[PDB]
Write a protein that binds this ligand. Structure first.
Ligand SMILES: CC(=O)N[C@@H]1[C@@H](O)[C@H](O[C@@H]2O[C@H](CO)[C@H](O)[C@H](O[C@]3(C(=O)O)C[C@H](O)[C@@H](NC(C)=O)[C@H]([C@H](O)[C@H](O)CO)O3)[C@H]2O)[C@@H](CO)O[C@H]1O
Ligand SMILES: CC(=O)N[C@@H]1[C@@H](O)[C@H](O[C@@H]2O[C@H](CO)[C@H](O)[C@H](O[C@]3(C(=O)O)C[C@H](O)[C@@H](NC(C)=O)[C@H]([C@H](O)[C@H](O)CO)O3)[C@H]2O)[C@@H](CO)O[C@H]1O
Ligand SMILES: CC(=O)N[C@H]1[C@H]([C@H](O)[C@H](O)CO)O[C@@](O[C@@H]2[C@@H](O)[C@H](O)O[C@H](CO)[C@@H]2O)(C(=O)O)C[C@@H]1O
Ligand SMILES: *[C@@H]1O[C@H](CO)[C@@H](O[C@@H]2O[C@H](CO)[C@@H](O)[C@H](O)[C@H]2NC(C)=O)[C@H](O)[C@H]1NC(C)=O
Ligand SMILES: *[C@@H]1O[C@H](CO)[C@@H](O[C@@H]2O[C@H](CO)[C@@H](O)[C@H](O)[C@H]2NC(C)=O)[C@H](O)[C@H]1NC(C)=O
Ligand SMILES: *[C@@H]1O[C@H](CO)[C@@H](O)[C@H](O)[C@H]1NC(C)=O
Ligand SMILES: *[C@@H]1O[C@H](CO)[C@@H](O)[C@H](O)[C@H]1NC(C)=O
Ligand SMILES: *[C@@H]1O[C@H](CO)[C@@H](O)[C@H](O)[C@H]1NC(C)=O
Lengths: 317, 166, 165, 318, 169, 318
């Protein structure tokens, strides 16, 4: 006449302990997600997919960036082969600036009220910039050239003036001609100089002629330079020509999440963590899909699977 | 560690599909049960759990390295070093956290078994002899007295003492 | 879990210096040193580890502003490090409390087994942490228990007769 | 006859966290994370410097606000929020790296260049942007070189500084950019202007630019500053044409010290090994949640309300 | 509980094993080592040693020029990072060791108390509880009988009443 | 009769640390931190190149020290303290950046630029700083362009290198700044000098600058080195008026190697995967206390000389 006092199971996953690897247990759960949604989950977020628009292009007015030149966004998205430059060119401080845009939350644009002398033809256009079928140019930039071929470009001064509450990012361009024959045509024979100075900036640019390969079928280059114009502070442009003067001035408003990804949008699904391959959602505190991520996220770890025991030791008879 | 599991008790009851801890029943009348809040005293902490694990200490991060363009080479390497180091931390931290809270779980699963057991043998008092396989030899004759904390020890102190002594 | 605090002992008595007796006899009706000193030292032992302490220099300025790209990298590294140290603070406190609770309970239960082995066969434990002693015990006997000078053998003869009949 | 065992308990027990329980109450618990920061700066034991409305870069080039702080050595350095770095409008290049050398540094000594100028040159340039004794002045450790005969060409000039001392020396000059072509012509003539600078380790060339800009401090003009290290037993040569702001003295940085950026008021009596924008922090506790950026031997910053560490389980009667 | 508590000393004389048997008999007095119980401790110690040295590291590259100058601002940012990483890894090391020592010691403590219980409930009624980690046996137990107990073979039922007698009188 | 139970103890036992007690004797312990590192570079299994005195930059440019190491292949590259990258005094732009790319590089490869110069230009210009056989000489991948006729002006020139290969290429050229105007006049003439560089990606203008500078290696004149990447199938053009040090071959970093800055001598008969300046490390141990600076697959650096891990029980003696 006796009384006896646990459960075991046919299959026990093995966890790791401080003394024992390979220790069978009645149930154990994964603490690392290794499967993540292929798509980007965008529920409950006001966002903007720039498509083949580069974030720099928004401020500059690249033709692909036309329906993006203003907006507001919780979230902003960038794509693999976005087009920043219509016309061959490089940007000074491009990475210092792209980040500024991808952590903003919208762009407002202001006209500069620039006004050019009757000596000056400001309707410059290139066939790098093809709006519908015609020669166009950057939406917020006027390519000044002297109106009569070869005739010397007049000394011109244009001053933007910030009267708004918050600082305005202002962008301008400098033109670098392909051949010395070409420089005289547009601006003239004179010694060129562009002097841009505000209260918290001074600089100066001098168009350089040189033999260069053809990019989008153009040899000449437009380098783009930008600065922030503080509230209550004017900025002055004095130029011989070769200035791609800003018709407009971008303003960056608020703060938003910036995603660089090739995954397609899905607004069915919710998330707060995105990477390149898309998105990751779970409450597992770890993850091994990708090391580089955006927004609130689980920390990256090397191991494919980590087993946390939810049960007692599994001992079959 | 505690003697109870993989100790004197020499396997589990794969037959049991209800509860971690139960009673195996033997007397002339009849022959398997389960003790209820020894196994939810246990579940309360197994589901004290993953509360630690899944509560999000979530700080929002931004992207310090662009994928779709050249990053300046010096700062590029500083970033790849800081992140390789922050990973080698969290991979450690994760590996310890599961391996230490596995070690804590596994060896707390008998504690309750032992406390159930020693509860029982304090109920039975001098009316029963241990037998050392976690079983109790009972030297007298609705045995859910012990299962449901009922059993009076003086009530059959009685003949059982002398069933031992014969 | 050790049986005592969350198991067979049902509550604590609101005893003055001592973490861990009460006995009942005809002429009188509380006492609490070695057991508690064994515990309290461990509490300080944990505290002493906590207080013990490198220098660090400013990498982002307060009153000027910092080149963007580097400012972001500084913020990201600084952020992720706080993430790691917060996890560590939350885990250590969580764990050392897990141990702290469950240590006092150890120094409780071993006192119980010390006693139960010391009365040997002259008492029965009844399942709730009281020892029922069949052989009568005056106060000066109780103190023979608290100072561990209690001899079981001499009472034994009287006990067994009381236990069996 | 009975004997009974047991543990203490408390009426209002405090609560803590474990690995198994979100809310466990316990006889006692203490604090693990600090929160009560002290607002003043606790500078006891430290030989220190509160620059006031003087910037550090101002020390190397001697702005008037900075006049008292031109030399000396410190346990620790303190910078106010509104400190004046430039009185005349200008910028410095690699200024952040420069400011940090100063903040890491223990002390500064100034060594004269020995520069001398011809009669046609006017060493004694001044501006009302920089004022001493309520009168127009220029930076203390720099000289503004213009033509004394107004309109006339700046004479070609050569200035060399030789680093005789065993220590490396930090040297700062300025490149003045005028506003008018009118203005540039009056000071330096119609010359094509150039400033070139060479040493064994450092080569660079500077050309002044006319530009139109809005007034700062009442001045359209700009003076941007540059700096380099002159290694010992070596010489740096200054070749200039008109536009240079030439050093009359040179900085030397001594030792390693703490640098503090704070606008909170000093309290000398209390001592701390920790500081932030608010005062200091005093604790044994290994964590803190005051602010994510500090300086010195400081506790780690955690984003929590508080974390409670138990000092047993409190079980009440019932 | 067992080593820092009621078992007052450890025997230096024992060399084969961690856990020991020593008995008082009329024929002889002997020292015995339990192969099973010590093996359990040794297995869980070598398990910790393995987990300790089972570490594989991602390859790393230099971010600090040893023989050339480094720009001042970037240097400060690397210094602050490299030192903060180091501070974490030093605190993480002190944790690891101070935690796993706590555990190594107590694992060792319990394995003994488990052997002790193993003997005790094995004896059932033939013997009693001395808090010297000792059992008075109340019958003549000889040299074959002694590690009848350590083989764990020992059967109370055949000594039976002899054992109850002289406990009782 | 009695039967006892006991643990063992030893006459002398090791000391360890716990979460509650700092001081707890145990029978045995094992060290978990490694300090008995090694003093040689274990390069068995690793195809390696030991630079000696040549600095990595010198590989690309063509310095006389690395004249053996102009072209190579390795999974490891070893730099030395005494490194020499220059003969003629000069510095390089983005030097750390370029240097780091080379130290990562598993290889270097050279392709002739094939540039051709006219009758007026002298392809062979040598300096006494760079001596090969004895006879003066010059960097082995560049060429120093000067007028054959001492007085004459440099001819305007176009030189273009086209990258035919599939992979991208690294091209370095130099700009030479003369000490004095007369120097400048002999070498390149009295005309204003402009070097202009252009590629699909890359656009820049350089102007040689004349200034007095202190002699190094016996030369006041200076050469500044510039680099860029020529994308596959791209072409890069040099329009120059003189003062150009022009490439005669181009570089092509290959694969990935492992950069090592090390004072230690080679041992090609042991293997290892961790390296520091001191030597190499082989240990089972997780943590290490020798060097804060380490390279490759290495144990983490902890600010402690010892952490003892108890591998036995509580030691209680007779
Ligand atoms: C009539 C009218 O609108 N008001 C003018 C008034 O604008 C002008 O004030 C002056 O403008 C000149 C240049 O246009 C200077 O900037 C004068 O200021 C100083 C200065 O203090 O900074 C004077 C100083 O002597 C100069 N230093 C030298 C020696 O070079 C500097 C210097 O020109 C600049 O710093 C160069 O960038 O300028 C300023 O008062 C006055 C007369 O100029 O006449 C009013 O009627
Ligand atoms: C009389 C006296 O004080 N001693 C002079 C002595 O200084 C001078 O030595 C020379 O100085 C010239 C320039 O002033 C050169 O620098 C000479 O060196 C070389 C060189 O080896 O580097 C010679 C070389 O042929 C030159 N390379 C070419 C072809 O361009 C270079 C070149 O000028 C510089 O590198 C340009 O920066 O210079 C140096 O020996 C000699 C004759 O010059 O006469 C002594 O009496
Ligand atoms: C009005 C103006 O400047 N724009 C020109 C433009 C410029 O000449 C050029 O961008 C300056 O760098 O060139 C355009 O295209 C032309 C070609 O079709 C031609 O065949 O070659 C020309 C110069 O040699 C010139 O480049 C263009 O970009 O569309 C014409 C445009 O009006
Ligand atoms: C770089 O120069 C080469 C050679 O002039 C250019 O490539 C030639 O490409 C054209 C059309 O793509 C062919 O018709 C020729 O046969 C090619 N020549 C050779 C010998 O390959 C190339 O287009 C130039 N690169 C750029 C970007 O302008
Ligand atoms: C720094 O300048 C000094 C002086 O111009 C140079 O040293 C001297 O050498 C010249 C000629 O050999 C002598 O006329 C001087 O008397 C020397 N000066 C001293 C103090 O001994 C020195 O060579 C220059 N340094 C460099 C690196 O060019
Ligand atoms: C901006 O321009 C307006 C008019 O041109 C002027 O009133 C104001 O002073 C200028 N602001 C600054 C900061 O220069
Ligand atoms: C709690 O403990 C700390 C130190 O043990 C003590 O200062 C305090 O008085 C105790 N009681 C409380 C909660 O105040
Ligand atoms: C001491 O510890 C080391 C490491 O675990 C082990 O190799 C050795 O066997 C131990 N000493 C003894 C006597 O067992």
């Amino acid at each position: 006449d006796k009384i006896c006092l646990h459960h075991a199971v046919a299959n026990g996953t093995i966890v790791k302990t401080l003394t024992n690897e390979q220790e069978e247990v009645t149930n154990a759960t994964e603490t690392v997600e290794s499967t993540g949604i292929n798509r980007l989950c965008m529920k409950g977020r006001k966002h903007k997919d720039l498509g083949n628009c580069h974030p720099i292009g928004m401020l500059i007015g690249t033709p692909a960036c036309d329906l993006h030149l203003t907006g507001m966004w919780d979230t902003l998205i960038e794509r693999e082969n976005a087009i920043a430059y219509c016309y061959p060119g490089a940007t000074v401080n491009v990475e210092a600036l792209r980040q500024k845009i991808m952590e903003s939350g919208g762009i407002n644009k202001i006209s500069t009220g620039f006004t050019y002398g009757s000596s000056i033809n400001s309707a410059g256009t290139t066939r790098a910039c093809m709006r519908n079928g015609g020669n166009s140019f950057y939406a917020e930039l006027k390519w000044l050239v002297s109106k009569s071929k070869g005739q010397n470009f007049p000394q011109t001064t244009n001053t933007y003036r910030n009267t708004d509450t918050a600082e305005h990012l202002i962008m301008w361009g400098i033109h670098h001609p392909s051949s010395t024959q070409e420089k005289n045509d547009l601006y003239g024979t004179q010694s060129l100089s562009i002097s841009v100075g505000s209260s918290t900036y001074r600089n100066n640019f001098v168009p350089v002629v040189g033999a260069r390969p053809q990019v989008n079928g153009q040899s000449g280059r437009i380098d783009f330079h930008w600065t922030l114009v503080q509230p209550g502070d004017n900025i002055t442009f004095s130029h011989n020509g070769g200035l791609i003067a800003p018709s407009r001035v971008s303003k960056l408003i608020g703060r938003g999440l910036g995603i660089q990804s090739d995954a397609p949008i899905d607004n069915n699904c919710e998330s707060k963590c995105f990477w390149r391959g898309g998105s990751i959602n779970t409450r597992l505190p770890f993850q091994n899909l990708s090391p580089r991520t955006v927004g609130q996220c689980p920390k990256y770890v090397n191991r494919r699977s980590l087993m946390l025991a939810t049960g007692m030791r599994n001992v079959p008879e | 560690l505690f003697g109870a599991i993989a100790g004197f008790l020499e396997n589990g009851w794969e037959g049991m599909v209800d509860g971690w801890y139960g009673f195996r029943h033997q007397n002339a009348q009849g022959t398997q049960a389960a003790d209820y809040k020894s196994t939810q005293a246990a579940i309360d902490q197994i589901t004290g759990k993953l509360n630690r694990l899944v509560e999000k200490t979530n700080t929002e991060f931004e992207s310090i390295e662009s994928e779709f363009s050249e990053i300046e080479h010096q700062i590029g390497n500083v970033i790849n070093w800081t992140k390789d180091s922050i990973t080698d931390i969290w991979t450690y931290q994760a590996e310890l956290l599961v391996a230490m809270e596995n070690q804590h779980t596994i060896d707390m699963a008998d504690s309750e078994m032992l406390n159930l057991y020693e509860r029982v043998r304090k109920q039975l008092r001098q009316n029963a002899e241990e037998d050392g396989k976690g079983c109790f030899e009972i030297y007298h004759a609705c045995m859910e007295s012990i299962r449901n904390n009922t059993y009076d020890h003086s009530q059959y102190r009685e003949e059982a003492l002398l069933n031992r002594l014969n």
